[PDB]
Design a protein around this ligand. Structure first.
Ligand SMILES: [Fe+2]
Ligand SMILES: [Fe+2]
Ligand SMILES: [Mn+2]
Lengths: 285, 287
């Protein structure tokens, strides 16, 4: 039975991503959030509700990535150095999720926080979203999995990290780019800096598995990938309408979703499927 | 579908274990090992071989805890705050495994390192040891596991972290306690500081699962736990005989194993089963 030997490369990229993930390490206590109170109170009820709802959605994403996606992808990898990177990423997913609670503690009361997490748990669209993603992970709860199933779990992971999350990062970046909630915005940037290299690395692993598949299996997962992409897109369009109508940003957010879906596709080595970033969001980055 | 909410406690201990794990975070770049070359050459061939073999075994343990053990236990936990802690511990298992490679790069040539890992991979007793433990994790590869299966996987994890590893930490500690390989010894101590709180935490979770089981299931896993304990112990005594006969430490290591088995049992809330020794005083100096 093999132990991980870092003095013999198993691939050309794992050491680089290991070092980078380590270099980027951070935790919530680093960023103080209290000074955001001064711009929080200037927002409207509907804006505050939107912000709280998108942050609850982001927490759910990271909860599922740290507690389901990374563990079940990594346990079936044969490459022990890549496993190590994915284990570290999974731990950072939990740092992300905890950092949203740190923001909430400054911006909401205990009763309001419970209202957020109750709303997250019962929201039909969030349930549908996460349910579709996690169903690819649940296929991996058996002793022998096919490479098609592992490929598609990696596709689902890239789509969550690089794509389905970003309907949620839009609003924190949009406010930070206007100089509102900028401390919370520095936390979201740290998170994004992690998610970016997460999606890149899982996408590299996906392309390596893909190249081992037979031609018939390649055609089957390409079809499933394109379908999943547009299935999630449909649901996200419904989610964005529900969250952002009240504050006039539905069509901006949808443009941000399409941009990030294209990024996700490219992390997988695939061509873009939708035809620039909102300039205020760009300033928040 | 629930998201983790750290502003409402799911239990009394996960927050403090989260904070402690973060506080203790470290990586291999933080300890330079080159200065160990001076005492490395003072060792015999047989002592050097022993040291490389036990670090090979340690690397294997951490490889399996990070890549199988923590992931498959945490995926089935319902407590989301406890899941967060196990995920962070799993990542630290990978830092541990990499830190052994950092030691090897200084102490062994490229071909000597290959020999270590080939020896690790083909060793009958290490395969039997690791195979018994990972067979409890493999049971968790299905959509719905029972709490007996989950409990027994947690027992296996505590036995690996708190007990079956220490046949291996003995020799780095013993040599550090004699002034040899002390920078590698600082690394081993960092690892041990992690492993201690890992075993405590998983043991708390085990105890909580145990109290949820039916009486009939409790009786079943209580007996399996004691059988597993003594099955592993028999294998570990064969392992220690094979590793340590050449350097005359077999019975010293066995005392250390029994001491750490008792600690594992206490992490699980069980009474000790081996006679109470003092830790070897040279090992104690290495700590
Ligand atoms: Fe991520
Ligand atoms: Fe451990
Ligand atoms: Mn994430």
């Amino acid at each position: 039975m093999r132990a991980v030997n870092w003095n013999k490369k198993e691939d050309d990229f794992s050491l680089m991503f290991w070092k980078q993930n380590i270099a980027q390490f951070w935790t919530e206590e680093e960023i103080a959030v209290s000074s955001d109170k001064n711009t929080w109170v200037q927002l409207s009820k509907e804006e505050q509700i939107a912000y709280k709802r998108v942050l609850g959605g982001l927490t759910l994403g990271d909860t599922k990535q740290g507690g389901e996606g990374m563990p079940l992808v990594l346990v079936h990898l044969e490459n022990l150095q890549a496993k190590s990177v994915l284990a570290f990423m999974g731990a950072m997913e939990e740092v992300h999720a905890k950092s949203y609670s740190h923001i909430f503690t400054t911006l909401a009361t205990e009763e309001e926080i419970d209202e957020i997490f109750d709303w997250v748990d019962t929201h039909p669209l969030l349930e549908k979203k996460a349910g579709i993603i996690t169903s690819y992970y649940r296929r991996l709860l058996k002793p022998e999995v096919t490479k098609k199933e592992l490929y598609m779990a990696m596709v689902a992971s890239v789509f969550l990290e690089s794509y389905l999350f970003y309907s949620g990062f839009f609003y924190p970046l949009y406010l930070a780019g206007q100089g509102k909630l900028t401390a919370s915005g520095e936390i979201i940037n740290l998170i994004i800096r992690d998610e970016s290299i997460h999606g890149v690395f899982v996408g590299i692993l996906a392309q390596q598995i893909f190249a081992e598949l037979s031609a018939e299996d390649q055609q089957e997962v390409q079809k499933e990938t394109q379908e999943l992409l547009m299935e999630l897109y449909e649901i996200e369009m419904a989610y964005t309408e529900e969250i952002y109508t009240s504050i006039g940003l539905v069509e901006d957010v949808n443009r941000f979703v399409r941009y990030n879906a294209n990024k996700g596709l490219m992390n997988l080595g695939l061509e873009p499927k939708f035809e620039e970033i909102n300039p205020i969001v760009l300033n928040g980055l």
